[PDB]
């Protein structure tokens, strides 16, 4: 299961539709609690950060199965995967250290890569990429618009000659501005807006609110 | 913010209204992790159970500034209100703990009643006279359990009477809560502790029940 | 799996507890406490995630010892609230990630109190969760009533167990921890219906009892 | 309450004093859950995962209070203080959200550093650290072993005049080997050994184990 060509690499070929959020549907942002910071700017919730926690349980457990008794490195693009790469990986250990079939190899290995995306150029902020030479890599992204992070993070990684390369990204964006790169373990298809909050910003600001949701052309408007 | 007159009960006066889930609305199984026991039966999934505890931590929010340094006396209807119960005096007591304003008094004292058509069991109520009372039910329906239960309790002479309940179904007229989760159709549900015959409570996610489930587990 | 019924209350095969020594605690200005329990709480004997961290395998061992089997479980309201929610919580998650499939839920829930009907716990496989055991007298005569109406067996689930110097003392089978004879709040545990809701289990000072005896 | 003079960095002034484990003060590793991968190497257990969650609860009201009302700045030391920067913001923010006070400052801002310590030589992998100037920062760190690490990565942030600099770390260790440098929030003071677990690791190895164990003879041995 972990073996895949690298040639596939963001295809998304094999994987498992992720769960599709209808255009234009959104919750009420005064139905949740919404902090004090927050509440003038946020007005529709795309998702729950429950329902984003659900949804990493899934995908974790799909991940699991993909890599089961094998090495797996992960790589966190920070900032803005940090709350999706730590769900992922507390849900990974559980559900080995839980499972009924047992393994001496830990649950993954950790690594962390800064990625500052210029549509153009790409700067990285990382230890030497050698590390993952013959490793079965997985490349844990937010989320996908583009594609362009991903796709030339992904040509310095075929580089190093990887074993095989997958990526994880909460979200993906349907937009006609794709270059068609998709991920194999995606949690959400969302229509084209840009979302803050569980770790997603706007200008470094509403990483905090533990919810998915729109901007507000308010909101754009005093953090542009 | 605590005080409120008594037969305001199951009229929902003044409540904030609940999220309102509308017909044939529902996630796909498919895109969660569904244990094995529950695997054959589960297809549709009403309210995911993060988003249950996100609404829950809004009710408790809701609840904490009506009761705020006021003695308050919460009620679970077992079996199940047990999830939600437990959800909610989690979120209270944290609410509470990490609160500015601070005070003496605990975030609330808990209790617990049984049912029975069946009816709550809820030994010797008279220890409830002259206090604020919450009752804590998993979903309301026609509204008969809350109301027989409220008139026994009535009875004692509480200081004043609410209802907090995760769900409240649009049936033909009826009871409400004053702190509700959820307003959703006229269906049966299972998960979060709904039961359908005792089983599906342990489902991690409040699901429509199925045709299969029906089938396989009516008495 | 399943058992003797002569064998309930003997601790017969079990995995001994965590031993807390006498006198052995954290001190509680180390931890957040409330502003209701500040006044009252200095000693704290097990912080609330030691009690979690213990309660995790708690329920693992109850996981290997039912697998395959429809298992009843039987809370004793109100004090045991706090501990079986957490057991059952991890019972249906080790369940859900085991992978080594099962189409018997993980457990059954069932509520009894203090000062109902029990036949409805014949010929199933019961376990009865406790808060604490200190004389043993509560499981002890329970107990007998529940095995009047015949189950497949029989065992105990108890957070804690006080070390008196009773002889013949009743003992569960699945015990997180055996700590020195002192009453304890917190966690659940009360004293005079005050502390259930603070979240670390902490001595019963002499403040805490004059204040609410 | 969040001013404090640069000079006084690694002083520890003012500090509440960590929890104290005695010597020789460990639980068994067979009364917890240890999974496969772990179970031949966990002997003794200084610190559950539970207490580590505890005590880190009263470390983020703490920094809430001392802080209350500022723009904070707080820096995640990579690798090793992923588990305990990601506990503490998600208190700050908990806080914050459940506070009576109705703050409009989010309740931090994040950013991410790596180290990497030679015993000498200090790598710092990050952004630009001039973003620091005039801003009240709290480093967070795992451990506190020798202090060599916080006093040579302190002197680089000192150089672009940051308003205030506290250091949080989970850990600090009674040693000899120490240059005397001390945490303004720590958790807790130990024994002088080495730990693994709770991100703690040896040679990459352990870091997702639930608890903080002591290194064995077995691990040596094995990941030596
Ligand atoms: O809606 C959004 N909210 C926040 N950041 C976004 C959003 N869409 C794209 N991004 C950022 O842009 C990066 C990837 O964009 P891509 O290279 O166009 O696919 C992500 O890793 C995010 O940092
Ligand atoms: O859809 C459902 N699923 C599970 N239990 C239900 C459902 N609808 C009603 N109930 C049970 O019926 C009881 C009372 O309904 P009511 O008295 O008609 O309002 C509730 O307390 C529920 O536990
Ligand atoms: O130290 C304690 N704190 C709180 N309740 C206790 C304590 N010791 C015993 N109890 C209560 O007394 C019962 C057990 O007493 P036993 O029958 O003497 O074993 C339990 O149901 C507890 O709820
Ligand atoms: O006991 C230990 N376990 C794991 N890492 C440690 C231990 N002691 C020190 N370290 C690592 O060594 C770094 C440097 O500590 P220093 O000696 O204070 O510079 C810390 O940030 C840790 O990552």
Same mark, same amino acid.
């Given at each position: 299961?972990?073996?895949k060509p690298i040639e596939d690499y963001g295809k998304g /070929?094999?994987? %498992?539709?992720?769960?599709?959020?209808?255009?234009?549907?959104?919750?009420?942002?005064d139905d949740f609690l919404v902090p004090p910071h927050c509440k003038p700017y946020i007005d529709k919730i795309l998702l729950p950060g429950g329902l984003?926690?659900?949804?990493?349980?899934?995908?974790?457990?799909?991940?699991?199965?993909?890599? *089961?008794?094998?090495?797996?490195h992960i790589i966190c693009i920070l900032k803005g995967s940090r709350?999706?790469?730590?769900?992922?990986?507390?849900?990974?250990?559980? %559900?080995?250290?839980? =499972?009924?079939?047992? =393994? =001496?190899?830990?649950?993954?290995?950790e690594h962390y890569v800064r990625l500052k995306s210029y549509q153009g150029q790409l700067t990285v902020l990382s230890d030497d990429l050698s590390?993952?030479?013959? /490793?079965?890599?997985?490349?844990?992204?937010? %989320?996908?618009?583009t594609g362009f992070t991903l796709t030339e993070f992904g040509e310095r990684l075929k580089a190093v000659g990887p074993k095989s390369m997958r990526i994880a990204t909460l979200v993906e964006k349907r937009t006609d501005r794709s270059n068609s790169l998709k991920?194999? *373990?995606?949690?959400? =298809?969302?229509?084209? &807006?840009?979302? &803050?909050?569980?770790?997603?910003?706007?200008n470094e600001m509403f990483?905090? *609110?533990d919810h998915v949701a729109v901007?507000?052309?308010?909101?754009? /408007?005093?953090?542009e």
């Amino acid at each position: 299961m972990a073996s895949k060509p690298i040639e596939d690499y963001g295809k998304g /070929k094999g994987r %498992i539709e992720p769960m599709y959020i209808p255009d234009n549907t959104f919750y009420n942002a005064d139905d949740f609690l919404v902090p004090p910071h927050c509440k003038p700017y946020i007005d529709k919730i795309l998702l729950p950060g429950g329902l984003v926690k659900d949804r990493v349980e899934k995908l974790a457990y799909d991940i699991h199965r993909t890599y *089961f008794g094998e090495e797996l490195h992960i790589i966190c693009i920070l900032k803005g995967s940090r709350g999706f790469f730590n769900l992922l990986i507390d849900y990974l250990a559980t %559900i080995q250290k839980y =499972s009924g079939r047992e =393994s =001496s190899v830990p649950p993954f290995f950790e690594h962390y890569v800064r990625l500052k995306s210029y549509q153009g150029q790409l700067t990285v902020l990382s230890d030497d990429l050698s590390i993952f030479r013959d /490793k079965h890599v997985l490349i844990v992204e937010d %989320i996908v618009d583009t594609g362009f992070t991903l796709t030339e993070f992904g040509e310095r990684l075929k580089a190093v000659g990887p074993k095989s390369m997958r990526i994880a990204t909460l979200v993906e964006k349907r937009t006609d501005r794709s270059n068609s790169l998709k991920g194999d *373990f995606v949690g959400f =298809s969302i229509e084209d &807006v840009w979302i &803050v909050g569980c770790c997603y910003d706007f200008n470094e600001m509403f990483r905090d *609110f533990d919810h998915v949701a729109v901007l507000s052309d308010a909101a754009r /408007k005093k953090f542009e």
